[model samples]
Target chain A: KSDRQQNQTRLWLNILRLHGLVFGDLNRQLLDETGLSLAKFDAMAQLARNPDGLSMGKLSGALKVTNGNVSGLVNRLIKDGMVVKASFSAKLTDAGLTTFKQASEAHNRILAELLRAVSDQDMVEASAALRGILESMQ
Target chain B: KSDRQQNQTRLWLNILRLHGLVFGDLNRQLLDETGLSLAKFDAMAQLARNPDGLSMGKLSGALKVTNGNVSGLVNRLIKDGMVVKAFSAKLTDAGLTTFKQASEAHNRILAELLRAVSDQDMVEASAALRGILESM
Candidate 1:
């Protein structure tokens, strides 16, 4: 590989490893504390943001998952009594909203703690690079 | 949220978005080129590195998955005639060929998608990333 390719590959691997570590940590914490998977938490977050509820297709778009994927997750959430579904859309139950609100607080703290390892300058620089890459790719 | 918490959240979102975009891109490319899912590709890559093959437990550890998850994937690969399983797991001749080719394709896809990030960017990103992980 050329220098560019090598650098790109290295960056790619670094991002993959970072995501793995961070995601695993967050997932474990969320599951232990709230009995919710990241997927479930994320879905609830979206539904909470949209008070009127979201159609299956819209939810799938927002979550960047397939309709079927969102369907299965929403179904599980429904069974768990965290969500309520209508004919075409889903909304969080009262319990679901409360759980998500609490989880969001914890989630923020967890993110802050994990990111506190780096300085603000470092985080800024890292985000800049990622943003540049993301923009170019998109 | 305080400014510090806000900054942390922003950084967290960036990583999530980056991973989502890149992972989706490479996954699509790998599937298109090799008829392989990213999960299967990762497993095959691990197996390819170990010439003598790996026990189910070892492979599971290496893949960072449960025994059942690894078992199911290996079974699927077996069904596809890409892996042979006994006490341990090893790629078949077809599997080896497929993995190398798919890996090359994956590398190319990654390289192209990530080309905007220079070596200097990589160093900066990596250092910051390590700092965050280290702090946690």
Candidate 2:
């Protein structure tokens, strides 16, 4: 019998489900508060790390998305006047930076409350376990 | 100093990051092996559970996705000749066969990915995360 396999499968499935629930909650709140999708916020955060700007190629690599997808997100952000495209690189405008800062603070607060359910010991142990699992897989 | 908040924030972000890595890995493998997106596999699995069929509304609710997105996915499956749409949406014989095969393959892939972690680790982590979910 594949009962062993089945247990492993359930564990894995629950992980995926947990991720989905958390992200869904976070994404909805982000959209309501900042009118930004997780995708957009992620891209902006990457840009914030490199003030000089990053080429579309580098941005896609960092976001682990396609060039086309990054281009589209950047285009929309440009339309919103929060991003600028020059010399094949994209950078955030002052308005974009401010928005990102505000959104990030709010995002952290939500994550804190959501995670408060888990004890500190549980958090540390879980994080370590996850890291161990990931390493084993890789 | 809100050290508790800081710790919680770190833990939450790590959970998100770990999930991203695992799903990204799993999704890419599924696409390469079965030409199925995770969404398609999930929908087919739901259909397999109910032999008769499911309305678009019911399917959307089960998948926790928008009606429009589910409609599009169902259409794509139809185009693939694996699904049939009538009064209610049902998988064709071909679709059922595909789903079973895909599911088996997906299980193997998940098991392989999970081999890195012990059963104890998974159980503990799942319990901790479940508590987080309940709290949220």
Candidate 3:
């Protein structure tokens, strides 16, 4: 039983390290090309996807951040002229919509190239390995 | 060219949202079990992996956050006795090593579950779609 636990420990260490590597690579590329960090970019991109935009509540739920965090991210985007807030109305304003559209377009260009850099065969193997891990077989 | 721009925008939105979903799930579970925010856990988790322990400089590189961020994270871990610091040390002290060992156990138990929860055949589709957009 003790030996089993020891082996499990080593396995997880490698798994966490691999997870970090994947996220770091994706984030690094996104950060380098765009002045936007992944958080801000995600917030703005989410808004752009919804033509009507989301409420602070809905945005928080969708973006997976707290209301405070989303608010700060949006504020930064507005300051950068990459996003605008629609006030007075219950839904997104035309300017906010336009900005989201523009930012989304720009980010897609960058992300697409990054994904391509991962070979298809390796991606297949990764997907399968991950699927096995998650299913508790690994 | 103009129409192409609109499609690019759409694809970008998808990629960004996908990222949020994956991260959000990871954070929710880690927070529930450890009371540690994803950022904090991630930073410490990296250092905890190092057998020799890590300097503040090296820890920052491994975590990919700023050095100050790593410092803040390590401070919280140290306060909790889940981590310890030794400047330029070659071997981990007992408490720090124990923490590392425990975290490793926790992660192994949880990681496969996370992978399972987020794993969808469609993400491969998304990745492929993302590839097409990148080529454009």
Candidate 4:
């Protein structure tokens, strides 16, 4: 079926479930372990990806919550010292890299254990599934 | 039937579906019709529940968000004139009240049609389901 409002509705329900369980849990753990929210962790993850940090705009692009949620997270991260602005960009500091290494490792393990094998496929499909419905709605 | 990782995992999956379906759709509508994101909509909903404005801290208590996303939304809403900070509290503006009325109605209709009549039960259960698991 190219689309069914019913199935798509159910699909959205499932996405909400996975998000709460995983994200809530992840947020809790991220708070407990690293004193970070998933939002902040996500910002660092993007910074970690680039190694050289990214522009405020670029980081916003990477972590677009469809609005100003980016500046909120980035500004908070900057306040926390895990990240710094240098050369007109937000870059992870030495301490940030060290801290993020641990957080990242923990994230990988939790994600791997939670989704288990074929985790990548599951995540990829989950993303595509979102894209699919969004396109249809448009 | 306490829990199993697989089913719980799948439960998470389904919850995600409902969230994205309803939430993303709601957010898109909120944006196009009202120039608000779901975050702002949620903040407005909380404000709507209390006719009087709420304490910044209480608003955070209601939203929880497990963190400071509350202030971010609050500040943005204030900047946008949907809310005003008076006596260190957040109260919806007359304009905000009028505007949110429409958004609230839109939310109700879409929710009613999309889930079709059992919408309250579905939403409540979905909420409780999150709470049930969260409390566990």
Model 2, which residues run further than 4 Å from truth?
A: A1-4, A64-68, A112-125, B64-68, B86-88
The sequence of per-residue lDDT tens digits that candidate 4 reaches over residues B77-134 is 8888888876344556664665657666555545443544333333344344434434
True-contact fraction per candidate equals 0.59, 0.48, 0.04, 0.05
Relative to the unseen true structure, what is the C-alpha lDDT of residue B125 in candidate 2, on a scale of 0 to 100? 70
The total number of steric clashes, by the backbone 3 Å criterion, in model 3 comes to 3
Model 2's CAPRI class is acceptable
Q: Which pairs clash inside model 3?
A: A105-B9, A112-B134, A134-B116
TM-score list, all predictions? 0.85, 0.83, 0.57, 0.51
10 residues in a row with least lDDT, candidate 4 chain B: B1-10
Runs of candidate 4 exceeding 4 Å displacement: A1-3, A64-68, A113-138, B1-25, B31-136
Give the lowest summed-lDDT range of ten residues in model 1 chain B.
Answer: B60-69
- Clashing residue pairs in candidate 1 are A117-B135
- i-RMSD of model 3 (Å, 1 decimal): 9.2
RMSD of 2: 3.1
DockQ of the candidate models in sequence? 0.51, 0.47, 0.14, 0.09
Stretches of candidate 3 off by over 4 Å are A1-34, A64-68, A78-102, A124-138, B1-49, B64-68, B81-84, B87-94, B97-101, B104-136
**Residue-level lDDT tens digits of model 2 in B8-122:** 6556556656666656667789889999877788888878888888998787767621123777898999999878986468989999988988988788877766766677667
Candidate numbers sorted by DockQ from highest down? 1, 2, 3, 4
Please provide, for model 2 over A40-125, each residue's C-alpha lDDT reduced to its tens digit, 9 standing for 90 to 100. Answer: 88788889988998998888777732233778888988998779744578899999999999988877776665565657776676
- Model 1 lDDT per residue over B1-136, tens place: 7767777667767777877777777888889999998878888878988977899888876762212377889899999888898569998899999998988898988877776665776767776776665655
Q: CAPRI verdict on model 1? A: medium
Q: After superposition, how far is residue B88 of candidate 4 from its true place, in Å?
A: 26
Per-residue accuracy of model 3 over A6-39 as CA lDDT, tens digit each: 4334333434343344345545766676555656
